[PDB]
Enzyme design. Structure first.
Site, PDB file in Angstrom:
ATOM      1  N   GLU A   1       0.912   6.019   8.555  1.00 46.37           N
ATOM      2  CA  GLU A   1       0.437   6.795   7.438  1.00 46.37           C
ATOM      3  C   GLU A   1       0.510   8.257   7.788  1.00 46.37           C
ATOM      4  OE1 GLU A   1      -3.650   4.902   6.763  1.00 46.37           O
ATOM      5  OE2 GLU A   1      -2.462   3.811   5.230  1.00 46.37           O
TER       6      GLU A   1
ATOM      7  N   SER B   1       4.175   8.581   1.024  1.00 46.67           N
ATOM      8  CA  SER B   1       4.381   8.499  -0.511  1.00 46.67           C
ATOM      9  C   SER B   1       5.505   7.736  -0.669  1.00 46.67           C
ATOM     10  CB  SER B   1       4.433   9.946  -1.270  1.00 46.67           C
ATOM     11  OG  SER B   1       4.754   9.579  -2.755  1.00 46.67           O
TER      12      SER B   1
END
Ligand code: NA
Ligand code: NA
Lengths: 235, 235
Positions: free
Chosen positions: B149, B195
């Protein structure tokens, strides 16, 4: 006047959906005596099961919510516990939020061992309640129940007496009377959230400022019904 | 060799059980192309619904677990996410625990903006993985997926490139190779958890060390199926 209130808090139990169903079948057959409002709080993953299968004269509660409320409401769940010591170990704002969003709340308070030993329990608890009080919208006190948790007597090797429960519930009622008036003070249920078992529920229920219980471990056992039925000893 | 993996993380969504059912009906009709392992993680209160109604060729995941595992397993849920940035904003031990108790895990890592700006991303991430590695029992690496992440690119006004994803997944694979060997490194799926949308999934999938995605918001939209199907571009 005030209806006795008993909330069973399963905490992180039972370990399986099969055991939860067996517990619900036991609760559904229980004969309630007297007049008492019963709410059962369970882990999130078990709420839909409770909501489907639990007797409809009792209500289901979340054990906590986040800053979520719509999800829980979408199942038809009306209650949540806020502030429980385990979670504690912000809140006034979360109470305001849950209430503005149509939830009924069980708002927990209580002092730790050092404050109790220092003679500051009443000061410490009063301050917690004085912080809650501005966060309750006008007209939402019917949807509030307060639970006193003697955190000083949980896992510390110290035990609380029946008089300690009564004294601390009286403290809370008095601060309500002082700050929002006798009418609200007279109607708000104040619960004892310490160790409540079939052997002490009747003596605790009889205390004049104790309106019920937020039950821990006994809420998973057949003794829960004894505690629910201790309402007949509260005047 | 490694099967492409896509996990959809609904996070705290949707707001109601009726919307969750509509999302599940949409997912159940989706035509998956190629070869891909799909897992869907949802709020706890929605897990029983997912588990009952979601297509059985996909698996359901918890979004987190506590130090509980038996409850989730009692529904037949096999997966959990651990370490997700929102939760982060202990872990090696919780990974050991979940794995010893038969769970499959998606283990999240990733650095914050200051480490990224300081040129220390690779150092920071490597250290996180070096801490995870001793906590995986022998024979349990088949049950581990790692998700990177880029926390530095979430709500900071900075964006991550396709090359940043590839570089950071390679870093992770290299530290696995260095510490537990090429066979484990070659088989562990390493996901990009930044994303991911239908407009960039195909280019990301084609990166050689990117084996899939831990999808955020697009997991609630019809675009999820585009991301699942980007596996055909990964060699
Ligand atoms: Na009483
Ligand atoms: Na790839």
């Amino acid at each position: 006047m005030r209806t006795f209130f008993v909330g069973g808090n399963w905490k992180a139990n039972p370990k399986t959906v099969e055991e939860a169903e067996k517990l619900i079948e036991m609760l559904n057959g229980a004969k309630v005596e007297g007049n008492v409002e019963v709410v059962v709080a369970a882990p999130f993953i078990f709420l839909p099961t409770l909501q489907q299968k639990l007797r409809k004269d009792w209500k289901v509660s979340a054990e906590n919510v986040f800053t979520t409320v719509p999800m829980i409401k979408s199942f038809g769940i009306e209650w949540t516990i806020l502030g429980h010591s385990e979670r504690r170990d912000f809140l006034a704002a979360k109470a305001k939020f849950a209430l503005e969003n149509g939830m009924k709340i069980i708002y927990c308070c209580g002092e730790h061992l050092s404050e109790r030993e220092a003679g500051k329990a009443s000061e410490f608890v009063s301050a917690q309640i004085e912080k809650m009080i501005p966060a309750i919208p006008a007209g939402k006190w019917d949807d509030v129940v307060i639970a006193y948790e003697p955190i000083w007597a949980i896992g510390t090797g110290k035990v609380a007496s029946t008089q300690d429960a009564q004294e601390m519930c009286k403290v809370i009622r008095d601060i309500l009377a002082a700050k929002v008036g006798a009418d609200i003070a007279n109607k708000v249920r104040i619960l004892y959230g310490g160790s409540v078992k079939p052997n002490n529920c009747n003596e605790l229920a009889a205390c004049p400022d104790v309106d019920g219980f937020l039950v821990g471990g006994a809420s998973l056992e057949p003794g829960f019904i004894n505690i629910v039925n201790s309402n007949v000893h509260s005047k």
